[PDB]
A paper describes a structure:
Ribulose-1,5-bisphosphate (RuBP)2 carboxylase/oxygenase (Rubisco) catalyzes the carboxylation of RuBP to yield two molecules of 3-phosphoglycerate (3-PGA). The Rubisco from the Antarctic-dwelling methanogenic archaeon Methanococcoides burtonii likely acts as part of the AMP/ADP-recycling pathway by scavenging the RuBP by-product. Five L2 dimers assemble into a rare (L2)5 structure observed exclusively in thermostable archaeal Rubiscos. MbR contains a unique 26–30-amino acid insertion between α6 and β7 at the bottom of the βα-barrel, and deleting this “bonus” sequence yields enzymes that are catalytically competent, albeit with altered kinetic properties, and are incapable of assembling into (L2)5 enzymes.
The MbR asymmetric unit contains five LSus. Applying the crystallographic symmetry results in the L10 biological unit consistent with previous biochemical observations. The MbR structure (half of the biological unit) contains 10 Mg2+ ions, 5 Cl− ions, and 294 water molecules. As expected, Mg2+ binds to the active site (5 per half-L10 decamer), stabilizing the carbamate formed at the active site lysine. The Mg2+ ion that stabilizes the carbamylated catalytic Lys-193 coordinates to O2, O3, and O6 of 2-CABP upon substrate binding. A second binding site for Mg2+ was also inferred from difference electron density at the interface of the L2 dimers (two Mg2+ per interface and 5 per half-L10 decamer). This Mg2+ ion is coordinated by a structural motif unique to MbR, which adopts a loop-helix-loop conformation. The motif, which forms a separate domain, is encoded by a C-terminal 29-amino acid insertion in MbR (residues 361–389) and corresponds to a β-hairpin motif predicted from sequence data. Although the search model was at the lower size limit for the Dali server, these results suggest that the structure of this motif is unique. Because of its strategic location and its clear functional role (see below), we named it the Rubisco assembly domain (RAD). The Mg2+ ion is ligated by oxygen donor atoms provided by the side chains of Asp-366 and Asp-368 located at the N-terminal end of the RAD helix αJ and Glu-179 and Asp-183 located in helix α1 of the βα-barrel in the LSu of the neighboring L2 dimer.
Author numbering:
A (entry chain B), B (entry chain A): 1 to 473
C (entry chain D): 159 to 316
D (entry chain C): 1 to 158
Amino acid sequence: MSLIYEDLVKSLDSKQQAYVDLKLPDPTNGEFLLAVFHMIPGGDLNVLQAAAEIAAESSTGTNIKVSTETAFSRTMNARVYQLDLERELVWIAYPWRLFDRGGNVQNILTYIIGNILGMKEIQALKLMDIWFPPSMLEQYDGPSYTVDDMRKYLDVYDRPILGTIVKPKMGLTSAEYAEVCYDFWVGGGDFVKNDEPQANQDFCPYEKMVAHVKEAMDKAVKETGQKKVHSFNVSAADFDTMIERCEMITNAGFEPGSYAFLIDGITAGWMAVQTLRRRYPDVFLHFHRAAHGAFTRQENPIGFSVLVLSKFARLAGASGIHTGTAGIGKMKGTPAEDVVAAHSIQYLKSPGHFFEQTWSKIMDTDKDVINLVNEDLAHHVILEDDSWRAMKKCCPIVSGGLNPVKLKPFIDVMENVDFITTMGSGVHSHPGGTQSGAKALVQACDAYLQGMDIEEYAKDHKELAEAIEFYLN
Amino acid sequence: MSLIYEDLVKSLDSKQQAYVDLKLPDPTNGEFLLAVFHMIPGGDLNVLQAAAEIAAESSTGTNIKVSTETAFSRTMNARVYQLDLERELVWIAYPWRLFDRGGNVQNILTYIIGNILGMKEIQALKLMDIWFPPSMLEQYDGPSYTVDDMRKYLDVYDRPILGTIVKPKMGLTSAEYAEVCYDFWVGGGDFVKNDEPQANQDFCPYEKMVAHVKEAMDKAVKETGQKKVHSFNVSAADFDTMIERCEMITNAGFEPGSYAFLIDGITAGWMAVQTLRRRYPDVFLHFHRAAHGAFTRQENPIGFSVLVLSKFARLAGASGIHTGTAGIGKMKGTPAEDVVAAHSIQYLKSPGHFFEQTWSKIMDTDKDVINLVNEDLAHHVILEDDSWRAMKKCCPIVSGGLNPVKLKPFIDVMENVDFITTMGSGVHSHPGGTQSGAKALVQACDAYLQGMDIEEYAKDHKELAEAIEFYLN
Amino acid sequence: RPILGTIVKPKMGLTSAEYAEVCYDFWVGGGDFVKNDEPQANQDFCPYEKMVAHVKEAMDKAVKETGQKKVHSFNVSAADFDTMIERCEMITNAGFEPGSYAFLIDGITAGWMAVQTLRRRYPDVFLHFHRAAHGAFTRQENPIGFSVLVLSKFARLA
Amino acid sequence: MSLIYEDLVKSLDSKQQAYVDLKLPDPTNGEFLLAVFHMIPGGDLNVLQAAAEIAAESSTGTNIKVSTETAFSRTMNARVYQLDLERELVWIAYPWRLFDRGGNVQNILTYIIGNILGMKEIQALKLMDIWFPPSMLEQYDGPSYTVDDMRKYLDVYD
Ligand SMILES: O=C(O)[C@@](O)(COP(=O)(O)O)[C@H](O)[C@H](O)COP(=O)(O)O
Ligand SMILES: O=C(O)[C@@](O)(COP(=O)(O)O)[C@H](O)[C@H](O)COP(=O)(O)O
Ligand SMILES: [Cl-]
Ligand SMILES: [Cl-]
Ligand SMILES: [Cl-]
Ligand SMILES: [Mg+2]
Ligand SMILES: [Mg+2]
Ligand SMILES: [Mg+2]
Ligand SMILES: [Mg+2]
Ligand SMILES: [Mg+2]
């Protein structure tokens, strides 16, 4: 085994022994959800003892062996099966029979990123990656409406979906809000999203915002001759107010496919996400992630990675989630963290950080799955008539202090154009305002698509020229 | 102003100028939600420029001033009004007109601990404290069912409510679960709670668990002549499953006051917390906080404090919330954090960290508020017939690696007994089992109340003597 | 010619998604009929509601690709009368093309009352009688019981 | 282990080895429905190959190992874990996860006293006893009305 490992194993209590199995036959057999954590002990206990306590507390156990313990309960124990003592990593196998039925995501998180995060026996504890076996992946929903469905509605292919966020973040009225929408759309933009805290403030009655946005869209659609989309912030105080807001939009007379529902998944919760997925499965569910920084940032030893968050959004059924600008914009931080996460939600097969994931439902050795993976890499729309085989894609939403000049840099690190980009400041701060602001973004996209440098395309494209002058000088 | 504070103000952009008012006349006038963050800038920006940036992003702004901005929108800018450069603290005033109506708590959190946690222009960002003006508090629910109401039902006063959590955390069946309930209650325990991830697993049908607990309670109540409570985990995949589980308990048909509803508030979400408060206002709402460590853990420089979590739980209407053992048990970590938070939710008037909080609704100078406060400090039940005057009590739940030998030490740090304590491993791991574990916990409470040393009290109480032997070895 | 069919194997262990792949593979390779292995039902890892759904999708594709109509015989055996009709009604509203589904009942373990309930409630669906446990009655080594002739004749009468 | 049992183990094919564990560490752990059959083989096959074949057909297996088999399906395999060769008895452990949910009894009997009764490879196959772990009993109804309730209506006692 190794002298060190045999000694670490001899150091375990009768309690700890039950949450360790460094000779686990097949972790990828289907019985388990696999997890890897960055872990650092917080004194008294050694690495294997601390890993055995973390496993106990995220599964069936507690601080001391209890008299109420059964033999059947021991079969549900999570078990430490692998360790990297240099990189300080811990591999724990979680029996997915531990999880609450009916496809509950908050329950998985209650175990693997719950109570364990507050244990004084750890100094750092970051959940880095997880593996969902086909047997478990089948118990959850997964996305029912995707970016492919949106693209079919918009008729927008082989480029990113060009979006904006209505800015100011707060303070505009329901009339002023709709003007910002109209101007972005009519200027050539595709998608408008509500800034995350914009809801029913006394000066912007939700009922009026919805009616004006519907009128504004109708105008932009007739003038441009092109379909447009609005992602509405549907987060509320409670279940009933959210549904009241969903139904306001649902009954406003929008053309099906032209409206999406945004939810602040971290603050509103994973229950509001699943509710929306299940109640409105033919509407694009946009997961905004405000407050994830406590979990995901480099500076924080305790929490979870952006890959984990992104993977759980796809499992829960989010049509899209914000994955970051790989540090090109205003938020932290890198292509290593952000593009790995985007690829885990975009593709059928991905590396990603520690566990390679194929989002099938059936075995990845079946010729038909191998085909789907190949077809996926060729940029063909899959799972239209064979949904049972795999979980559908969850779209990256790239936002955070971007502008037309930061587009080509982001696509280069991304290695593809199957994402939604949203630029607030980068559009509404433009010298000529939102319409010119939108044209600059459109122009920078056309430049990229026809292999040109923006400075060369800008020679006969005023809005992009002004943007380059403004966003650099 | 001062030499350095002058230079810092001269360094601000026309945009950053808009989110700074160091000469704010009256921050406590009632227009603002006051907040204080611990903050360190992350290169390129100075303290005031970073603070102006945070303020913009947590109210009405973005990284560049926008053409779409209005004079009316500027009225709602959050303002940096005070600093402590040595202690690295910044005070920001948030107009509560920013916040969504209908008493939406997730929307507050979306601004003040949302996107700003992810900004690369900070190294640390920890929200330490908040101040709710009487005007704002009236727009929120606050608790409707309190520990005063549960103590009335139970007929338990002048001591903590002594409870347990059913252990194993997972693996027991619905019938095995009900035996652990009965044994604790019949041994002298008041309160039984579902361990946070306990729900509808395949081997513990929720419907059977509920029915056996109904029967188990009746047997225990009848044998002890003493009323008992059960806190059920109603956290589910979605809204509709949660109400179905709540409604299953509602018709079980327990005696009113004998059941509470538990919600994994962080993972389930604030919308779930609010839904239960508004839907079941005459049921004790129990806020379990699994996953809070990402935000509240000292090792993490980005997030928010335990005081803040606890204060927003009372605002949303939890009848109780977990506050910690002040580092006496297995979680992190101190009286400075844990007792301050408890006191904020227990009492009408509190210090707490940076803002003194009187939870009135009306002006803290009315002689009637002064009386409520004097009466509260005397441990007299308030707000039975004058609820309009102030927001009600939110109960500290003290859990995490405690045993009867750690009961006194916590009370000494707490400075009172108005709380619920749950001991899972400290009861079920008793060498005599759950019934002896409960007897040991009851005996330790009596020893504390009587002012007797446990080692002395245990000379004529075997279950306590056994606990002292076991838990100190 | 004979109707060429399969039984989804393994007998137990596949999920509802995996089950439907086996169905698709058989029908697309030229097979006509797929039946549930007799003890395949609503086990925790193969939700019956999901199985019916994926089988409806799997079939549609196999019919489109082969240009040939296909059939699935669904194990409708349950704990009781009410659960059995719940399963039947799930299939009845899934919504398959009439003729493309049959109902399978373990007539010895479930009973002759389950066999007659399905005949009378669903007269326009093929009633597939599976005889698991008949060996105690029919087996030549057993002196007491009844013949395969008797069992088969009574099933025709029912 | 014993030379008689060692050669009996060595006779097992790849498929049969999957449904045998004579070293099952805890058959009463709660995961299994324990069974004991009085069995005699049907010629060609020995005691343990016949047992491993019965175990196969009573759980997840079939005559020949299949391409469609998954690692997750092998976890629900019934395992032969004890033998009394003189008494002609074989003990099989059945994962209760195999059985149809909602406390369906018809289904338990379709596995443990179904198709296996008609198999060529046995002369005798009598299920003598079974053992229900507490985890399993809680998934089933059990009686609601009893003779203690009848005796109270009747006032008939002792
Ligand atoms: O509020 C903002 O800052 C944004 O609207 C972007 O506005 P700008 O386009 O004006 O920067 C987004 O909410 C953030 O991108 C969220 O971060 P992430 O996508 O990283 O979750
Ligand atoms: O699962 C647990 O660990 C507990 O049930 C305690 O059990 P023990 O009594 O066996 O430790 C609680 O959920 C934690 O105390 C929560 O932490 P906090 O109270 O800090 O939110
Ligand atoms: Cl080991
Ligand atoms: Cl100033
Ligand atoms: Cl063996
Ligand atoms: Mg925003
Ligand atoms: Mg295939
Ligand atoms: Mg717990
Ligand atoms: Mg007065
Ligand atoms: Mg069969």
